[PDB]
From a paper:
Complex I (NADH:ubiquinone oxidoreductase), a crucial enzyme in oxidative phosphorylation, uses NADH oxidation and ubiquinone reduction to build the proton motive force across the inner mitochondrial membrane, catalyzing respiration and driving ATP synthesis (Hirst, 2013, Sazanov, 2015). Mammalian complex I, one of the largest membrane-bound enzymes in the cell, contains 45 subunits with a combined mass of 1 MDa; the 14 fully conserved core subunits are required for catalysis, while the 31 supernumerary subunits may be required for enzyme assembly, stability, or regulation (Fiedorczuk et al., 2016, Hirst et al., 2003, Stroud et al., 2016, Vinothkumar et al., 2014, Walker, 1992, Zhu et al., 2016).
Here, to define the structure of the deactive state, we prepared biochemically defined samples of deactive bovine complex I and determined their structure by single-particle cryoelectron microscopy (cryo-EM). The map for the dominant class at 4.13 Å resolution, which we assign to the structure of deactive complex I, was taken forward to model building. The cryo-EM density map for the biochemically defined deactive enzyme contains specific regions of localized disorder around the ubiquinone-binding site. Continuous densities for the loop between TMHs 5 and 6 in the ND1 subunit, the loop between TMHs 1 and 2 in the ND3 subunit (containing Cys39), the short loop between the β1 and β2 strands in the 49 kDa (NDUFS2) subunit (containing His59, one of the ligands to the bound ubiquinone head group), and several nearby loops in the 39 kDa (NDUFA9) subunit are not observed in the map. Therefore, the loss of ordered structures around the ubiquinone-binding site is characteristic of the deactive enzyme. The channel cannot be identified in the structure of the deactive enzyme because key structural elements that form it are disordered and missing from the model. Our preparations exhibit the well-known biochemical characteristics of the deactive state of the mammalian enzyme (Babot et al., 2014a, Galkin et al., 2008, Kotlyar and Vinogradov, 1990, Vinogradov, 1998) and are highly catalytically active following reactivation. The structure of the deactive complex matches the previously described class 1 structure (Zhu et al., 2016) and supports the unfolded Q-site model for the deactive transition.
Residue numbers in the entry:
A (entry chain b): 1 to 80
B (entry chain e): 6 to 94
C (entry chain D): 5 to 50
D (entry chain J): 2 to 172
E (entry chain O): 5 to 318
F (entry chain A): 2 to 27, 51 to 112
G (entry chain N): 2 to 345
H (entry chain K): 2 to 96
Write the structure that this text describes.
Amino acid sequence: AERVAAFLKNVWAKEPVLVASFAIAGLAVILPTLSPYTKYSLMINXXXXXXXXXXXXXXXXXXXXXXXXXXXXXXXXXXX
Amino acid sequence: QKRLGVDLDRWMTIQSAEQPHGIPSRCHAFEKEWIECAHGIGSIRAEKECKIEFEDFRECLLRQKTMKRLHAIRRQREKLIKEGKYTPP
Amino acid sequence: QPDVEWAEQYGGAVMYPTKETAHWKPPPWNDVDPPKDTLVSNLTLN
Amino acid sequence: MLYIVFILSVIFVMGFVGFSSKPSPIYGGLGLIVSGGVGCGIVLNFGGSFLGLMVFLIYLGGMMVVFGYTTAMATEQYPEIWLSNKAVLGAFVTGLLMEFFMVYYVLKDKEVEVVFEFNGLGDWVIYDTGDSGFFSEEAMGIAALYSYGTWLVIVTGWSLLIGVVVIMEIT
Amino acid sequence: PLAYILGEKATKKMTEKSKLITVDGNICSGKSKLAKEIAEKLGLKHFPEAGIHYVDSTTGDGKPLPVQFSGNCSLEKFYDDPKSNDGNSYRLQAWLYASRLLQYADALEHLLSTGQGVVLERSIYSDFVFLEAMYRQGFIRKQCVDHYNQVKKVTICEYLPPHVVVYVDVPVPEVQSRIQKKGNPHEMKITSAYLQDIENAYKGTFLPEMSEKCEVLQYSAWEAQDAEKVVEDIEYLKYDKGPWLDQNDRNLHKLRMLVQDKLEVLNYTSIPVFLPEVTVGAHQSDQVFQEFTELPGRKYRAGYNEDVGDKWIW
Amino acid sequence: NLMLALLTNFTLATLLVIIAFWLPQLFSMKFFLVAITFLLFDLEIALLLPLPWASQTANLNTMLTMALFLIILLAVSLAYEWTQKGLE
Amino acid sequence: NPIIFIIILLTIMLGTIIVMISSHWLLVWIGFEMNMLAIIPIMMKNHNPRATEASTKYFLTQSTASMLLMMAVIINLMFSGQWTVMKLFNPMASMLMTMALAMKLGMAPFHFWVPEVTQGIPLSSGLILLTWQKLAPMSVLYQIFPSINLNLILTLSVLSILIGGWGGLNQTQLRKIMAYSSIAHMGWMTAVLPYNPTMTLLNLIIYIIMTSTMFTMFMANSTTTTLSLSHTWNKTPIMTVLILATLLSMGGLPPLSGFMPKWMIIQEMTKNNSIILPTFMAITALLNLYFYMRLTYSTTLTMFPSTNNMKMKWQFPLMKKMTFLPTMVVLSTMMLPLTPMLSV
Amino acid sequence: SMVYMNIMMAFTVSLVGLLMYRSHLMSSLLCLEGMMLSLFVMAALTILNSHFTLASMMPIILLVFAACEAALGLSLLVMVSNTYGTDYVQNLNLL
Amino acid sequence: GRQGRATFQFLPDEARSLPPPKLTDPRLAFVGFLGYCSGLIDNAIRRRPVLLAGLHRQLLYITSFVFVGYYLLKRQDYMYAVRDHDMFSYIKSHXXXXXXXXXXXXXXXXXXX
């Protein structure tokens, strides 16, 4: 190594707080794209209804039923 | 616009547009008339065809026509002092 | 033919003479120098 | 007593009377504390607690604080009393008579103005809103958003990059 | 010159063991020429003293231009015996100042690009000693000195650092005998009071030069002509808290850009103020400029010319 | 009421000043750059204020790219500050 | 200055792009104030007492200009409440819109800063950044061409040529003459805006190019008429011929393409039954020509500015657009009279 | 109508306060802060009453650009106090 | 007059590319002369011998003014056609606005001397 081994141990000796400024902020950018866990957070965020629900008048339609518990609609059940 | 924004979106300027969550405008129903009236160039240069739908829309934001009306009621309510006045509540 | 007297008449000041503007002196040739005299110049402690 | 916004709006203009008048930058600096702090209350009364506290954090927690430095850098030590100063008191007395004389005409609700708009009652129609929303509402429950307005975030970032670089080149 | 973001930058592989050392104040006789030639061991480049033929020697092509074309009726022999009624007096000094401003601009450009020890023979900061001494006796008009001071205030302030080391030579009042000993018929028969006033004005001019945070060193006639004594003093004495010590990023580049072109530095030297002694006539100057165009020196371009070079047309 | 809470604090504070006075009977331009940096950073903090407030409802893929971007330029401004800052 | 000078210069280029490509009222508000933060460092540059005085006089006039413009934006919420740049919808907001844009431009009542700001600029590179800056308020005026009252635009256009035509007669400073030709040309700009918004964009094209040709030829350092005098004999005689083509073109002369604005501005106005105004335009334009009349005598004559010092080394400036643009500035009236359609 | 008769009046009073002078250049920049403060309140009332929700971010952006001018213009004021002794409108050189 | 059914981004519309472009036009040659003229005075400002016989960077000066001038003339041929097309279509649609008057031998006063 020409600068990988040379210009790393010098940074630990001369101001090692600057190592933390690039590494922790670096992991803040790279890790969100790599991890297959960000998909779950988007699912519940859209599922949480802040506004009141709206009923649509159905004329021959699928995947829609009554307000009572039935196998219809989205209704996220990701890890209970 | 002097130079148009083609193949890119950066608007979100006009009222009664895409809501942050689902929150409505105070004059949402009135612009549903106004934008639909003046989408063509017919009442843009002349501005005479949509005069009926503009006066009610100007009334929505300012409420000046109701302000003059409520003042007329309040003045006549003050006129009833030492006269034939009645208060139900 | 134009001479040195013609250049003095069209000299850089105010073009034509005026009663109101007479104290208005012409600016230096390039880059004006500030009045550097009378400043703070290092404060003292006792 | 019955009015909430209208009483505070008079004090708001009263602060600006000290800006039309020139009572030395120190006493004029006190204007931004009085009119600024009351200026929060005018915003707060209609709703939106976040936007009302923005003046507290930036204007009252930065802007005039930095303006407090420059008053000490130039034109410092002593502020001259505005009672002794000529025409400064004259601008102050004429400034208040443009507002206090008008308030007497605002009494009995309606008033004549330079503009076509009238004063009105300002008690029942003071809020101008019924129920509107419910949860995370009041227009400024979700006030600022990085979503949708993605372009505005970049350009604000550009100008704040300029500010740090440029002032360094000036001084 | 414009794009310095890459490898080429100010104070890069420079400004270490390389400094501008000005050898000035030779009173009247050519005494500074011996000291500058001796100071060639430490200093890399030593420029000769600027005269009447220097402006054509630099930037031109080897051989100097004739007396009629180069400097309008300007000669060093005329100043040897200075006389009244439409003479040189001041216009040779203005030409001498323009040549000394040109050689300093070249030397400073030679210092910034490739760091070398530059030795100068009488700089800009010694020129007003050469003028004011002539003014003490009846030679130059009062209004001409004020015209010179207007050029002095503008041209000098463009250069942020003056000098590093300034050498001071104070000889005996019997220096006229040394001038008579030297083989020069023109330099001889000069006024003894003029040379005495030149040494008197220099004593009051060396004090602000030393106070300007530049390392000033005084030398005697017995101390002169010493290659070992002068070089050891230059190495031992270090410049501290001077105007020469400046930022390489901002101050040095703006200095380099102004000194890169000769026309940009001499643009401030030409004053719009009309003077009868400084040559105002355009009718004879029109033919004189036409004679310069007729001359086979430059005439056509900055570099390439017909019947001189030109390998390709494009 | 909020005004009832505020005025009671200020009136008793001024009351202590009445006790304090009536009851007894017998230059440098370098510090300006600090105020400049402070005010310019406040607005970037003001733009970064709605972070634990707007992230609850809005899309995360659109926000994260913009949220970090403000802190990046907040550090890039400091990266320009490092090259000759001052003795203070 | 290294890359940072180019970055600052690029943000003025980017700043006007926000003004050009826009739909929102607060978006153009940012675009104006993006320039305010970016012109000031180039206004300073050489650490001068004149530069400090010019920048403070520039800021305090143009900061008040933006805040007057923001009032017009807020009244556009008071009435209608639509935030799309098309119409003001008010007889009150239109007054505070046009007068605020008049402050940023060199229009009649707010002209006093223009000559004193131009004097305090250190270099010719900074002198371009006022003539190019005038594109930004002109771009907004093209967008809001209707709903704006004739009584407070045309009066400001007529008076500006009057005060511009008398404002350079008692001046010898080369920067001051260019600053008052700016005030003179702005009267020809806003006069077209009611009588077809077209040709106002072409009037910019002619003006911006013709002004940029001046300062690029003023790279050979000259601040006064007497300093530009020593140029005929001491400096190159072919340079005086090419400046003559730009001096005479700025005034109303038909063989040169600086008559191409004065072609259509009168032509479009005369179509709409107005003759008494275009008469007043052309006669006052001769006073604008009169500055260049006395300024052509600095180059055509000898004038005796010889100077004992003669330059042997050839001049090497930037000269980026100093060759391509004066060829278009001298002759285009015979080349492209159909360019009205191509531009707008 | 009711409140807008005061906050518009406060804007016009500050508009006079800017252009009127008693030699102090600090007071003009102080009034520029007040001008942006008066523009802040006038924008706030128009957006908060007529529930826009989207436009609420706009005075926050306006607040940023309020401080952009009222610092970079303030930095130039310091440069006047570096060249000259004390900041005054009367102390000028330009013609 | 003003733009109606036209949008920005890419200067010619491409949808209305029906009219034939300018081929070896006298208008192209005059801009070509200006391209040559710009390649003459560049050797005058920057001191170079002989404007006619000098350095051959003039080929760039000729081509650039021809290239930009060709698309500029293409914009001219487009915009003049559209302005004419909207004018003709306005008469064809309304008809009542444009009135026709034909066949008249009306009496007029005769001037003396």
